[PDB]
């Protein structure tokens, strides 16, 4: 009377969005599977983020730089959009140096290349410099999971360095849907659709595989009593 | 009822196809004998006057037509459900 094994179908477009359908499932197992994966996807997938920024002649985050349209906050907001992928597993922290002179539209590609460091979005806009404006940055990129506010980590490399909220999670959004499906005379079956948005550093398929593996590993912890 | 009226029409169309497998005079004998044309059973003498034959002549063609329809029904099974 046990249900047949479900079929895992994938609908992945590009490298930043994908839909994954598992059907048919026993009654209630769409919720049983969807929620744990969503919690892991939004908090546990390893990733990289900007955790500290140093800008010359800048004292606090709520100031501005003469010679650029964007104030410190807007550039910090643009830096939180930066997606970077480490090509070395042993690599833990890098610093990216940016020296640009106006009149220039500073992009993510203007960052100095670092060995085994890949900028996934080199077209990301950073700042717009007018003539005579000098922009010197040293941004610190760490490795982590989930979302860490700047105050809860407070990472500063040098004096006057501004901690920035670290969006470590490569997954940008998870939405799972459970629909009623049938197989013959059984009508309480579940159809689970998992939709994952990712920044592109990892595939939504890879994020799902990592989330499943994390949940599998935690299930092995219910062994060796006491 | 609409159901009763419909099954009457379905029975007529199935019988008309079953009688098509018969001959020309042979099918018309059953139609005239059972009253499928006028609505009344025509006696053998009345049927015999129409085709210019004796009474016992119809009984030969009428019964032989009956036997062949039984054979067709056993092979096609298209009239059994119309009697229950």
């Amino acid at each position: 009377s046990k249900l047949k094994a479900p079929v895992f179908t994938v609908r992945t477009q590009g490298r930043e969005y994908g839909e994954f359908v598992l059907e048919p499932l026993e009654r209630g197992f769409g919720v049983t599977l969807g929620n744990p994966l969503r919690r892991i996807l939004l908090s546990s997938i390893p990733g990289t983020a900007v955790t500290s920024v140093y800008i010359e002649d800048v004292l606090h985050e709520f100031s501005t730089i003469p010679g650029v349209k964007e104030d410190v906050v807007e550039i910090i907001l643009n830096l939180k959009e930066l997606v970077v992928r480490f090509l070395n597993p042993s690599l833990q922290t890098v610093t990216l140096l940016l020296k640009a002179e106006g009149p220039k539209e500073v992009k993510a590609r203007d960052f100095l290349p670092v060995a085994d460091v890949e900028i996934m979005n080199p077209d990301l806009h950073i700042a717009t410099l007018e003539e005579g404006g000098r922009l010197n940055m040293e941004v610190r990129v760490d490795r982590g999971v989930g979302y860490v506010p700047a105050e809860k980590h407070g990472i500063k490399d040098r004096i006057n360095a501004i901690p920035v909220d670290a969006v470590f999670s490569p997954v940008r959004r998870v939405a799972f849907q459970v629909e009623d499906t049938r197989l013959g005379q059984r009508t309480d079956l579940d159809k689970l659709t998992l939709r994952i948005w990712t920044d592109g550093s990892v595939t939504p398929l890879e994020a799902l595989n990592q989330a499943v593996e994390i949940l599998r590993e935690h299930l092995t912890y219910f062994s060796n009593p006491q | 009822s609409p159901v009763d009226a419909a099954t009457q029409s379905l029975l007529s169309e199935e019988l008309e196809k079953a009688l098509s497998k018969l001959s020309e005079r042979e099918a018309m004998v059953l139609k005239l004998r059972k009253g499928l044309i006028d609505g009344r059973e025509h006696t053998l003498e009345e049927v015999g006057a129409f085709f210019g034959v004796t009474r016992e002549r119809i009984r030969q063609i009428e019964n032989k037509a009956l036997r062949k329809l039984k054979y067709h029904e056993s092979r096609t099974r298209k009239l059994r459900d119309f009697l229950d």
Binding site: R27 | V3, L11
Partner: protein, 1113 residues
């Protein structure tokens, strides 16, 4: 499980017998047990003494005494054989020869009197029936002001209903007082001349009221003698009729003076004396003695009318809706009234047989034909509006039905004549008629309920009890007193603080003629017995009634009547204290008659050894089908050898738990929206309710079939049904009836019956088809009884009644009748209606598995999820307080009695919640568990909503939420807590008789009407849905012309169209163009029957035949 009782008001007297309005009135009418010589002149005894002696004149038929015999059959046998539970009636009559001087005495059999059962109902033709009490205007003399003429008043004299004409006395604008009788207006001066009044007498009695007596002065009628005025009056009343003196005197005697034709009634006579300050000798407007008419009431009526018009002190108008002016006709009076009508018809037939002659050998048996009396009695108990099919869904349902008061019925009001005045809650309804229990809709205010402590007196007026207060101290003396007597006293409220028996509050809330006043204790003369006397039984079963809006309390009281008995029925956690009395007074449960020991306990019967030593065996009603189909069974509640005291419960009846009324279940309720499944009163339940068989009810359906004599041959009930296989006949026994214990589904045969086919030649297509298969057509056809669609269950009983059986009175031509009972165990499903006692009702829209339901931190899932949006607009806060008290009792393992208006209050509920928290949370501490991370998050939000005090420990904040009835609740789907604390508690919810199983219906094609050829109506007839004018309007507004035309023609009454539509669809073809409806053809023919030439014409005005040439000669 302990029961904690709230309340401060001590009830000096208990509730009266809740069925005494039925039981006592019928006992008084029958007087079966009192010996004949001591029978009082009431009831049917009064009916005999009024119609007899039947003096034709000279033969006189006198009545000596009557007696009622034992019923021929027991109550259970009457139900099985469709018999009336009745007692034979014998009257000892004597025939007196005035000339010869010889008396012939014999006992004549007058028929059968239906008998009331112990619980207060009747078995009429095997069906349980309740005679609903009727309210109407009391007879007497009334003085209402003229709305057309300010300052003018009209005097109304009302006799008993259908016992005389209404009399109106009015001072006309010209001055003369006018008497209106039988729609004829004539001057009242003429009548007083007939009744022997002189000009000097009228001036002496009524000359002291202005010049109004001058209008009562016509010199023409004072000149004529009373005998001449009597003929003069007869001409006005009956113009054209020859005015002979003997004919004239008989008409006036029969109009105002004949006791057998005019009856003011005991209540009417008493009201007349009280209002007019006189003493009536009888119950007629006048008395005929010494060959002349003597006045009895017209002079006091006119004297009061002039005094009221003159504005003298002590004279007032009469409120006709005042409950002292409205009386109740109970079952005894209603039956007696119809008994008198039948006896009058019997007396008339006695006179004509006396006119026939043959007096040499005339006996009272020969003169008396009892059939007119039996027919009138049979008509009352069968076809009267007040005689109603007994509502016995649950024992409370039958109790309410027997206490119903109806303003409708014969001699009653109609909804057209029912204005706001009759339907409003008059101030005198207080303590007598419940201001809440009423049917919402067109019958609002027209059908009411007797108040819990109220009782109907001999005159028919409802009296309510009050405690006598003297010297500011409240005594135990209880006075039952009418509305008119109540208006004379200052009556304090039952909640007035008492120090012992003395009123302690300096300011006392009281009523004076229904108005709320603040008085000193020394001004208080009476006190209310209890808050319960204001309301009826159903309303008194609603806890925290004071916190519910009246409109929603109406719904709660009404829906308790609709609750179905449950196999695991539970008494509510929060009760009002009347649950025991309802079960006890319904006679549905079984109690020990006196002290004794139980000898035998079985599911069928209980045997108790009483102290005196006699063995009493009580058969138990088991799986009995009520009028509504709910299973009524009694389950024993004692063991062998158990000692029982007098009145101890022996067996619970339907919807009862240990003697307490159990109309539903006690379930864990979370008050919160849930994913739209709570939308607009919809209810979410857990699957755990189904697992433990809560809200599971047993329902029994009865199926009947008759084998008849037919001209072509008798129908045979047999197992040999032609053209049916062994699978269809598998469950039938050798007699053709389905075996007991078989499961039957829609389309299954309950009993096989063959009927001889009508002689008709077959269609030629069938003739050829039968000839091919070599099968000779049989002489009988399938007419067996089958399970209707959507029904079925388990066969539990087959009743077979045959012609010639003792007591079985089959109709002629019926050889036998077979009845099959099918029982189904119904679990709660989507579409079933649930309700609580506070008017919150809804259908189950979603059944969730246990892991999906919200659950407590200890893992306990809730049972029911209710939408909080149903509370604020309905303003029924009693359910919230019930939920809070239920939450405390759930963890303290105890139940509560909180009487209405005197019971559990918020401070005392919260201190119960404080103790319930110590087992709710203190048990967690002992188990080695602190505060959940999820609880900490909810507490953090809770202080942002102002629900908990900032700075306290999580335990203290959780206790603060608990004292508000709220807990931290976890979502079973996610495990995350609900962001705000949720009110969770235990509430009593009922499963109502409206079930989607009995209401779902569909039809493609089916039976059609005879004349209109349109589909029949009703699920029982497999009918189609009614597409009325408003639905036609909707399609017209949509422009859906073709959709409208199909419903008008193709799907209702286009005979050619509907046949062609069905044939086209089953061939995969589209339905053809519709044609003229057959109802229009009926309309045209019916218009021709009215000699109207209705013709359908074309563009060129030429006639168009819509009858296909079938009606053209």
């Amino acid at each position: 499980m302990e029961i904690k009782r709230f309340g401060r008001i001590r009830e000096v007297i208990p509730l009266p017998p809740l069925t005494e309005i039925q039981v006592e009135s019928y006992r008084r009418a029958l007087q079966a047990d009192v010996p004949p010589e001591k029978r009082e002149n009431v009831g049917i005894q009064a009916a005999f003494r009024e119609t007899f002696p039947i003096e034709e004149e000279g033969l006189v038929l006198d009545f000596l005494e009557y007696r009622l015999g034992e019923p021929p059959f027991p109550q259970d046998e009457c139900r099985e054989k469709d018999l009336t539970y009745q007692a034979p009636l014998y009257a000892r009559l004597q025939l007196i020869h005035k000339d010869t001087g010889l008396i012939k005495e014999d006992e004549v059999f007058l028929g059968h009197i239906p008998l009331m059962t112990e619980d207060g109902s009747f078995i009429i033709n095997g069906a349980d029936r309740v005679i609903v009490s009727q309210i109407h205007r009391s007879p007497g003399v009334y003085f209402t002001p003229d709305p057309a003429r300010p300052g003018r008043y009209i005097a109304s004299i009302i006799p008993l209903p259908k016992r005389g004409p209404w009399i109106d006395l009015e001072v006309e604008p010209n001055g003369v007082v006018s008497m209106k009788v039988n729609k004829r207006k004539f001057p009242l001066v003429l009548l007083l001349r007939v009744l022997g009044y002189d000009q000097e007498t009228l001036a002496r009695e009524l000359g002291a009221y202005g010049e109004l007596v001058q209008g009562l002065m016509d010199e023409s009628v004072f000149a004529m003698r009373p005998e001449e005025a009597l003929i003069r009056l007869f001409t006005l009343l009956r113009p054209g009729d020859p005015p002979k003196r003997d004919k004239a005197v008989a008409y006036v005697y029969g109009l105002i003076a004949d006791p057998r034709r005019y009856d003011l009634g005991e209540a009417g006579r008493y009201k007349a004396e009280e209002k007019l300050g006189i003493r009536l000798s009888g119950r007629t407007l006048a008395r005929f003695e010494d060959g002349e008419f003597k006045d009895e009431v017209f002079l006091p009526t006119l004297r009061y009318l002039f005094a009221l018009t003159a504005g003298v002190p002590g004279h007032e108008v009469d409120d006709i809706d005042h409950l002292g002016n409205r009386r109740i006709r109970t079952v005894g009076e209603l039956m007696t009234d119809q008994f008198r009508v039948g006896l009058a018809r019997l007396a008339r037939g006695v006179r004509e047989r006396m006119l026939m002659g043959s007096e040499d050998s005339l006996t009272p048996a020969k003169l008396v034909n009892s059939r007119p009396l039996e027919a009138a009695i049979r008509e009352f108990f069968s076809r009267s509006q007040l005689s109603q099919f007994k509502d016995e869904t649950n024992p409370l349902s039958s109790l309410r039905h027997k206490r119903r008061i109806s303003a409708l019925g014969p001699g009653g009001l109609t909804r057209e004549r029912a204005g706001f005045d009759v339907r409003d809650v008059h101030r005198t309804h207080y303590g007598r008629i419940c201001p809440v229990e009423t049917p919402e809709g067109a019958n609002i205010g027209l059908i009411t309920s007797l108040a819990a402590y109220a009782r109907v007196d001999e005159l028919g007026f409802i009296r309510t009890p009050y405690r006598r207060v003297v010297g500011g101290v409240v005594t135990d003396e209880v006075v039952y007193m009418t509305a008119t007597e109540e208006d004379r006293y200052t009556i304090a409220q039952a909640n007035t603080p008492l120090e012992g028996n003395r009123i302690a509050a300096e300011r006392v809330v009281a009523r004076r003629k229904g108005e709320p006043v603040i008085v000193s204790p020394e001004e208080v003369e009476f006190m209310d017995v209890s808050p319960k006397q204001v309301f009826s039984v159903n309303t008194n079963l609603i806890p925290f009634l004071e916190h519910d809006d009246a409109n929603r309390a109406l719904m709660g009281s009404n829906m308790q009547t609709q609750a179905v008995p449950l196999i695991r029925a539970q008494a509510p956690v929060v009760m009002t204290g009347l649950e025991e009395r309802v079960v006890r007074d319904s006679l549905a449960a079984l109690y020990a008659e006196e002290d004794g020991e139980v000898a035998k306990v079985d599911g069928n019967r209980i045997v108790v050894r009483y102290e005196d030593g006699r063995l009493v065996e009580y058969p138990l009603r088991r799986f009995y089908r009520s009028n509504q189909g709910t299973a009524l069974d009694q389950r024993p509640r004692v063991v062998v050898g158990q000692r029982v005291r007098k009145g101890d419960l022996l067996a619970d009846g339907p919807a009862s738990e240990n003697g307490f009324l159990a109309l539903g279940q006690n379930v864990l309720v979370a008050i919160m929206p849930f994913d739209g499944y709570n939308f607009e009163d919809a209810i979410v339940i857990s699957e755990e309710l189904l697992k433990r068989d809560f809200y599971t009810s047993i329902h029994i359906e009865r199926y009947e079939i008759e084998a008849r004599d037919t001209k072509l041959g008798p129908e045979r009930i047999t197992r040999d049904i032609p053209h049916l296989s062994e699978a269809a006949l598998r469950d039938l026994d050798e007699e053709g009836v389905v075996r007991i214990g078989a499961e039957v589904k829609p389309g299954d045969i309950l009993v096989g019956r063959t009927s001889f086919k009508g002689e008709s030649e077959p269609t030629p297509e069938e003739r050829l088809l039968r000839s091919i298969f070599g099968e000779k057509a049989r002489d009988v056809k399938d007419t067996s009884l089958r399970v209707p669609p959507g029904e079925g269950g388990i066969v539990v009983r087959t009743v077979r009644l045959r012609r010639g059986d003792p007591g079985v009175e089959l109709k002629p031509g019926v050889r036998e009748v077979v009845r099959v009972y099918v029982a189904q165990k119904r679990k709660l499903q989507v579409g079933d209606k649930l309700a609580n006692r506070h008017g919150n009702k809804g259908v189950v829209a979603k059944i969730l598995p246990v892991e999906d339901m919200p659950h407590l931190p200890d893992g306990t899932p809730v049972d029911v999820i209710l939408n909080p949006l149903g509370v604020p607009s309905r303003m029924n806060l009693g359910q919230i307080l019930e939920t809070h008290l239920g939450l405390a009792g759930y963890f303290l393992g105890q139940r509560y009695i909180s009487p209405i208006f005197d019971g559990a209050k918020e401070p005392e509920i919260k201190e119960l919640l404080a103790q319930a928290f110590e087992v709710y949370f203190g048990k967690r501490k002992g188990e080695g568990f602190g505060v959940d991370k999820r609880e900490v998050e909810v507490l953090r939000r809770a202080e942002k909503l102002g629900l908990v005090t900032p700075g306290k420990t999580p335990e203290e904040q959780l206790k603060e939420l608990f004292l508000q009835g709220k807990v931290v609740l976890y979502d079973g789907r996610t495990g995350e807590p609900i962001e705000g604390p949720i009110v969770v508690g235990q509430m009593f919810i009922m499963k109502l008789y409206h079930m989607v199983e009995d209401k779902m219906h569909a039809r493609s094609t089916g039976p059609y009407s005879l004349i209109t050829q349109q589909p029949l109506g009703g699920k029982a007839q497999f009918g189609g849905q009614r597409f009325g004018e408003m639905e036609v309007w909707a399609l017209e507004a949509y422009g859906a012309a073709h959709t409208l035309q199909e419903m008008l023609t193709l799907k209702s009454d286009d005979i050619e169209g509907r046949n062609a539509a069905y044939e086209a669809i089953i061939k995969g073809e589209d339905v053809p163009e519709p044609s003229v409806p057959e109802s229009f053809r009926v309309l045209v023919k019916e218009l021709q029957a009215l000699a109207l030439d209705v013709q359908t014409l074309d563009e060129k005005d030429n006639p168009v035949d819509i009858f296909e040439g079938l009606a053209s000669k």
